[PDB]
Design an enzyme around this catalytic site. Sequence first.
Site, PDB file in Angstrom:
ATOM      1  N   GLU A 238      -6.335   6.575   5.743  1.00 39.68           N
ATOM      2  CA  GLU A 238      -7.703   5.164   5.605  1.00 39.68           C
ATOM      3  C   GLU A 238      -7.402   3.983   6.469  1.00 39.68           C
ATOM      4  OE1 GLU A 238      -6.825   2.121   3.838  1.00 39.68           O
ATOM      5  OE2 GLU A 238      -9.127   1.888   3.537  1.00 39.68           O
TER       6      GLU A 238
ATOM      7  N   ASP B 214       2.615   5.764  -3.128  1.00 38.73           N
ATOM      8  CA  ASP B 214       4.118   6.828  -3.586  1.00 38.73           C
ATOM      9  C   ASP B 214       3.801   6.688  -4.985  1.00 38.73           C
ATOM     10  OD1 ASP B 214       6.690   7.477  -4.513  1.00 38.73           O
ATOM     11  OD2 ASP B 214       6.746   7.002  -2.662  1.00 38.73           O
TER      12      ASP B 214
ATOM     13  N   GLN C  50       1.014  -0.662  -0.135  1.00 41.85           N
ATOM     14  CA  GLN C  50      -0.032  -0.052   0.108  1.00 41.85           C
ATOM     15  C   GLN C  50       0.655   0.804  -0.133  1.00 41.85           C
ATOM     16  OE1 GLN C  50      -2.622   1.200   3.102  1.00 41.85           O
ATOM     17  NE2 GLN C  50      -4.328   1.512   1.736  1.00 41.85           N
TER      18      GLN C  50
ATOM     19  N   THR D 269       3.615  11.759  -7.948  1.00 41.88           N
ATOM     20  CA  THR D 269       5.249  11.830  -9.260  1.00 41.88           C
ATOM     21  C   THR D 269       5.177  10.382  -8.911  1.00 41.88           C
ATOM     22  OG1 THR D 269       6.152  11.500  -6.749  1.00 41.88           O
ATOM     23  CG2 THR D 269       6.070  13.869  -7.974  1.00 41.88           C
TER      24      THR D 269
ATOM     25  N   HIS E 283      -5.336  -5.915  -1.847  1.00 42.50           N
ATOM     26  CA  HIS E 283      -6.679  -5.416  -2.019  1.00 42.50           C
ATOM     27  C   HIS E 283      -7.449  -7.283  -0.963  1.00 42.50           C
ATOM     28  CE1 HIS E 283      -8.275  -1.803  -3.689  1.00 42.50           C
ATOM     29  NE2 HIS E 283      -7.221  -1.937  -2.771  1.00 42.50           N
TER      30      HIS E 283
ATOM     31  N   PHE F 118       8.043   8.248 -10.005  1.00 43.40           N
ATOM     32  CA  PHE F 118       9.323   8.561  -9.323  1.00 43.40           C
ATOM     33  C   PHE F 118       8.750   7.867  -7.945  1.00 43.40           C
ATOM     34  CE2 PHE F 118      11.052   9.782 -12.782  1.00 43.40           C
ATOM     35  CZ  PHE F 118       9.974  10.808 -13.530  1.00 43.40           C
TER      36      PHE F 118
ATOM     37  N   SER G 232       7.155  10.623  -2.339  1.00 43.72           N
ATOM     38  CA  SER G 232       6.553  11.384  -1.971  1.00 43.72           C
ATOM     39  C   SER G 232       5.371  11.430  -1.028  1.00 43.72           C
ATOM     40  CB  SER G 232       5.650  11.515  -4.113  1.00 43.72           C
ATOM     41  OG  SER G 232       4.999  10.747  -4.310  1.00 43.72           O
TER      42      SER G 232
ATOM     43  N   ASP H 180       9.975   8.099  -5.337  1.00 46.95           N
ATOM     44  CA  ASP H 180      10.533   9.200  -4.348  1.00 46.95           C
ATOM     45  C   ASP H 180      10.247   9.284  -3.153  1.00 46.95           C
ATOM     46  OD1 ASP H 180       8.546  10.368  -5.492  1.00 46.95           O
ATOM     47  OD2 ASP H 180       9.079  11.922  -6.630  1.00 46.95           O
TER      48      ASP H 180
ATOM     49  N   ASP I 289       2.300   1.736  -3.460  1.00 46.80           N
ATOM     50  CA  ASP I 289       1.064   1.594  -4.049  1.00 46.80           C
ATOM     51  C   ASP I 289       1.035   3.949  -4.346  1.00 46.80           C
ATOM     52  OD1 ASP I 289      -1.692   2.443  -4.989  1.00 46.80           O
ATOM     53  OD2 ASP I 289      -1.554   1.075  -5.554  1.00 46.80           O
TER      54      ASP I 289
HETATM   55  C1  HEM Z   1      -8.790   0.461   3.235  1.00 46.35           C
HETATM   56  C2  HEM Z   1      -7.501   0.033   1.903  1.00 46.35           C
HETATM   57  C3  HEM Z   1      -6.875  -0.743   2.425  1.00 46.35           C
HETATM   58  C4  HEM Z   1      -5.768  -1.930   3.253  1.00 46.35           C
HETATM   59  C5  HEM Z   1      -7.056  -2.293   4.686  1.00 46.35           C
HETATM   60  C6  HEM Z   1      -6.327  -0.747   1.095  1.00 46.35           C
HETATM   61  C7  HEM Z   1      -4.760  -1.503   1.115  1.00 46.35           C
HETATM   62  C8  HEM Z   1      -4.266  -2.028  -0.599  1.00 46.35           C
HETATM   63  C9  HEM Z   1      -2.670  -2.611  -0.349  1.00 46.35           C
HETATM   64  C10 HEM Z   1      -2.636  -3.349   0.194  1.00 46.35           C
HETATM   65  C11 HEM Z   1      -2.629  -2.070  -2.153  1.00 46.35           C
HETATM   66  C12 HEM Z   1      -1.466  -2.734  -2.618  1.00 46.35           C
HETATM   67  C13 HEM Z   1      -0.583  -3.306  -1.975  1.00 46.35           C
HETATM   68  C14 HEM Z   1      -3.691  -1.561  -1.903  1.00 46.35           C
HETATM   69  C15 HEM Z   1      -3.195  -0.941  -4.261  1.00 46.35           C
HETATM   70  C16 HEM Z   1      -3.960   0.391  -4.167  1.00 46.35           C
HETATM   71  N1  HEM Z   1      -5.575   0.924  -3.558  1.00 46.35           N
HETATM   72 FE1  HEM Z   1      -5.923   0.147  -2.229  1.00 46.35          FE
HETATM   73  N2  HEM Z   1      -6.971  -0.400   0.047  1.00 46.35           N
HETATM   74  C17 HEM Z   1      -7.375   0.504   1.281  1.00 46.35           C
HETATM   75  C18 HEM Z   1      -8.387   1.475   0.409  1.00 46.35           C
HETATM   76  C19 HEM Z   1      -8.565   1.463  -1.033  1.00 46.35           C
HETATM   77  C20 HEM Z   1      -9.651   2.741  -1.902  1.00 46.35           C
HETATM   78  C21 HEM Z   1     -11.195   2.905  -0.810  1.00 46.35           C
HETATM   79  C22 HEM Z   1      -9.265   2.881  -3.125  1.00 46.35           C
HETATM   80  C23 HEM Z   1      -9.735   3.917  -3.701  1.00 46.35           C
HETATM   81  C24 HEM Z   1     -10.685   2.579  -4.752  1.00 46.35           C
HETATM   82  C25 HEM Z   1     -11.389   3.561  -6.244  1.00 46.35           C
HETATM   83  O1  HEM Z   1     -11.244   3.541  -7.161  1.00 46.35           O
HETATM   84  O2  HEM Z   1     -11.943   4.420  -5.389  1.00 46.35           O
HETATM   85  C26 HEM Z   1      -7.814   1.968  -3.031  1.00 46.35           C
HETATM   86  C27 HEM Z   1      -7.102   2.359  -4.347  1.00 46.35           C
HETATM   87  C28 HEM Z   1      -5.875   1.810  -4.484  1.00 46.35           C
HETATM   88  C29 HEM Z   1      -5.140   1.951  -6.202  1.00 46.35           C
HETATM   89  C30 HEM Z   1      -5.049   3.576  -6.584  1.00 46.35           C
HETATM   90  C31 HEM Z   1      -4.840   4.088  -6.312  1.00 46.35           C
HETATM   91  C32 HEM Z   1      -4.992   5.269  -7.206  1.00 46.35           C
HETATM   92  O3  HEM Z   1      -4.339   5.217  -8.014  1.00 46.35           O
HETATM   93  O4  HEM Z   1      -5.676   6.145  -6.914  1.00 46.35           O
HETATM   94  C33 HEM Z   1      -3.715   0.899  -5.127  1.00 46.35           C
HETATM   95  C34 HEM Z   1      -2.759   1.416  -6.523  1.00 46.35           C
HETATM   96  N3  HEM Z   1      -7.287   1.539  -1.905  1.00 46.35           N
HETATM   97  N4  HEM Z   1      -4.430  -0.759  -1.300  1.00 46.35           N
HETATM   98  O1  LIG Z   2      -6.696   4.548   0.842  1.00 42.03           O
HETATM   99  C1  LIG Z   2      -7.068   4.781  -0.592  1.00 42.03           C
HETATM  100  N1  LIG Z   2      -6.102   3.982  -1.731  1.00 42.03           N
HETATM  101  O2  LIG Z   2      -5.055   2.458  -0.880  1.00 42.03           O
HETATM  102  C2  LIG Z   2      -7.995   5.461  -1.084  1.00 42.03           C
HETATM  103  C3  LIG Z   2      -7.724   5.498  -2.488  1.00 42.03           C
HETATM  104  C4  LIG Z   2      -8.727   6.480  -3.159  1.00 42.03           C
HETATM  105  C5  LIG Z   2      -9.617   7.422  -2.207  1.00 42.03           C
HETATM  106  C6  LIG Z   2      -9.779   7.149  -0.751  1.00 42.03           C
HETATM  107  C7  LIG Z   2      -8.901   6.481   0.350  1.00 42.03           C
HETATM  108  O3  LIG Z   2      -8.684   6.225   0.812  1.00 42.03           O
HETATM  109 CA   LIG Z   3       5.909   9.489  -5.907  1.00 41.28          CA
END
Ligand code: HEM
Ligand SMILES: O=C(NO)c1ccccc1O
Ligand SMILES: [Ca+2]
Length: 595
Positions: free
Chosen positions: A258, A110, A105, A184, A351, A186, A190, A188, A108
């Site tokens: 979150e 970053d 997470q 970003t 997830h 990268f 962020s 890094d 992701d």
């Molecule tokens: C609560 C949430 C988590 C833990 C209890 C959780 C966990 C992860 C892991 C372990 C990920 C990768 C190893 C991962 C990746 C990405 N998530 Fe997720 N996540 C929780 C909650 C959310 C929510 C809410 C979102 C947004 C969903 C939407 O589409 O509206 C969410 C997304 C993402 C995501 C996309 C981020 C982006 O580029 O906008 C991952 C790459 N997660 N999460």
């Molecule tokens: O937690 C998240 N992603 O892992 C998350 C992603 C998009 C919107 C709100 C959030 O809380």
């Molecule tokens: Ca970054």
Amino acid sequence: SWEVGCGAPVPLVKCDENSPYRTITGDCNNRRSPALGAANRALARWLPAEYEDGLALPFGWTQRKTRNGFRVPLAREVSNKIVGYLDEEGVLDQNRSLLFMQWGQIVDHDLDFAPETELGSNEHSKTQCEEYCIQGDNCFPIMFPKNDPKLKTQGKCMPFFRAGFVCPTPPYQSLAREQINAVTSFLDASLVYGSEPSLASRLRNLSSPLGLMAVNQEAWDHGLAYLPFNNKKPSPCEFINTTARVPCFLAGDFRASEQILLATAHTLLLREHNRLARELKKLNPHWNGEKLYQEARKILGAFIQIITFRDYLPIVLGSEMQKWIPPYQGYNNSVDPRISNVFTFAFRFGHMEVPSTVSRLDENYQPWGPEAELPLHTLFFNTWRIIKDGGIDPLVRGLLAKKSKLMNQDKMVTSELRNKLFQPTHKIHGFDLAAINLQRCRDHGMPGYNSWRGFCGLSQPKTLKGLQTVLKNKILAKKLMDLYKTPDNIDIWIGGNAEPMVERGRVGPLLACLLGRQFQQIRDGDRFWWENPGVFTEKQRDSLQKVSFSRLICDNTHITKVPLHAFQANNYPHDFVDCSTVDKLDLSPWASREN
Ligand code: HEM
Ligand SMILES: O=C(NO)c1ccccc1O
Ligand SMILES: [Ca+2]
Ligand SMILES: *[C@@H]1O[C@H](CO)[C@@H](O[C@@H]2O[C@H](CO)[C@@H](O[C@H]3O[C@H](CO)[C@@H](O)[C@H](O)[C@@H]3O)[C@H](O)[C@H]2NC(C)=O)[C@H](O)[C@H]1NC(C)=O
Ligand SMILES: *[C@@H]1O[C@H](CO)[C@@H](O[C@@H]2O[C@H](CO)[C@@H](O[C@H]3O[C@H](CO)[C@@H](O)[C@H](O)[C@@H]3O)[C@H](O)[C@H]2NC(C)=O)[C@H](O)[C@H]1NC(C)=O
Ligand SMILES: *[C@@H]1O[C@H](CO)[C@@H](O[C@@H]2O[C@H](CO)[C@@H](O)[C@H](O)[C@H]2NC(C)=O)[C@H](O)[C@H]1NC(C)=O
Ligand SMILES: *[C@@H]1O[C@H](CO)[C@@H](O[C@@H]2O[C@H](CO)[C@@H](O)[C@H](O)[C@H]2NC(C)=O)[C@H](O)[C@H]1NC(C)=O
């Protein structure tokens, strides 16, 4: 002229071409094309977007239009018939700690963030979407099936808003719709420092010339820092408990609170920056604030890069690691470092790795209190349990001693996330992350499962029987066919995650290919990659490769026993050693002499 023009979400500035430090926004990394990899630009497209009207409407929007001849199934249906399960027994990953999920997470966050569209606070829009479930503009509701118990209990739908996009925010109209990456590309750090100068500056302690990050002033952890609270009210963190009234934290990334274990990792990283910066002030008394900040920051980004590539990636990709990420040959200016739209879905394999509970352990790593094991759903946007229930040490120990959930074709995503998700904008613990992921796939115009198999050079099943052989699961393949009617229409998030895991890894072939390509590119196309000659000195490099997540914990908590390989499953007390047995980061190579 390719579609080269549009550029506007975008904050514009000049490049100091000899700066040894990254910009906050990512601009200036690539010298020939300064905007490459910068924040607030569009996600790259490896394949053309597939929308219902070719331009912007997602598949499933117009109830009469089909996808290759068939209706696309409701996101929440697929969720109910395929992704859900009831028995949490036997579901833990025997050789991956909870930290394994948690690091994913962090990486992701970053690399990518596509924020939802806002437009309208004091608008009946947020009302018209949640209250009445009327589809229209950025409101694209997840309708409940017939027979769904949420229908009896929650309403007719779950509100859902389409992702922001480049160019505007208004009715844009011709070329295809491209979602925004607000961070970003990268790796890094962020998520610690911010991606905008606006926030980066506010996160810093600028009233002291020490190059430190602002820390909480209302609360402390046995003398260790907490992230500062966020200004903005209403805050979802105080909402989940109006008595405790504890706000969310303020970090370089907006998603930091979150869940309690994410906020915990953010705190460890904040502390390391300050530790590093005061430790650097000791060796170089003449360096100023800015120099301290930039130099600690550079160090922290290298740390995230090293742990990700040395310790994390090899146990996600397994034997496919070498196939997609060959040994580093140096910086390649021809490589596109941008994060792709599909990556943000492929990286969601995480997830299915989240378990139903979080535990707090005392100093002997035995239960901490009577209510030590809590359901995941009570910890979404929960900061009070940290400030008022023991600090982060108990949660960190759980990270080290508990296991991740293992992906299982019969048990994909836990009900804590599948029925009880809390959204920062709404007030019920009743959302479904799986249905949301599915809906978002369509919102971002993703090609189907077979388009991606072909992209990765894998066979593309056309029949139920072809699909059984690829998934190696007769009944999963069959529920998939009954809902989708052709493997071409299978949303990538679920298609990718339904495949059996590669040897020594935690994702299948399709995901290994999509993840591996992306990581290879952000490494190869990063001018500030830690191993690129000139970024750090040889001696600095020899010191950096001794970092470990274990040492990070030792130096930044009051925990004195840690495992040597934090990502694998470790049993207390046999796999736990004394912190003094653990290699420290030697900062002497950062000492300067200016005479
Ligand atoms: C609560 C949430 C988590 C833990 C209890 C959780 C966990 C992860 C892991 C372990 C990920 C990768 C190893 C991962 C990746 C990405 N998530 Fe997720 N996540 C929780 C909650 C959310 C929510 C809410 C979102 C947004 C969903 C939407 O589409 O509206 C969410 C997304 C993402 C995501 C996309 C981020 C982006 O580029 O906008 C991952 C790459 N997660 N999460
Ligand atoms: O937690 C998240 N992603 O892992 C998350 C992603 C998009 C919107 C709100 C959030 O809380
Ligand atoms: Ca970054
Ligand atoms: C639980 O997972 C453990 C870590 O994934 C695993 O131990 C790892 O096994 C691999 C086998 O490929 C070894 O990998 C290393 O091999 C040598 C080290 O001797 C190096 O030259 C290679 O580059 C590579 O890193 C390691 O011995 C080990 N990897 C690490 C990072 O520690 C266990 O086998 C798993 N436990 C069970 C019970 O299955
Ligand atoms: C909202 O947050 C509240 C305050 O953080 C929390 O109440 C607190 O938690 C419990 C009550 O259930 C009490 O904690 C325990 O304290 C000692 C342990 O050191 C015990 O010996 C006590 O018997 C007690 O059980 C706190 O006293 C209590 N604090 C306050 C101010 O009420 C609520 O439980 C939270 N509510 C929800 C819905 O989450
Ligand atoms: C900015 O840094 C200063 C200096 O390090 C912090 O103030 C010090 O730290 C603590 C708590 O305030 C105490 O030991 C002293 O009162 C302070 N020492 C000095 C020399 O001022 C301050 O807390 C930081 N501010 C923020 C918002 O993080
Ligand atoms: C830098 O990266 C580029 C872009 O990925 C590499 O381009 C390769 O070169 C061939 C032709 O020589 C192109 O058709 C492909 O895009 C790349 N090869 C393959 C097999 O796909 C390039 O090789 C890299 N340059 C250096 C010096 O390493």
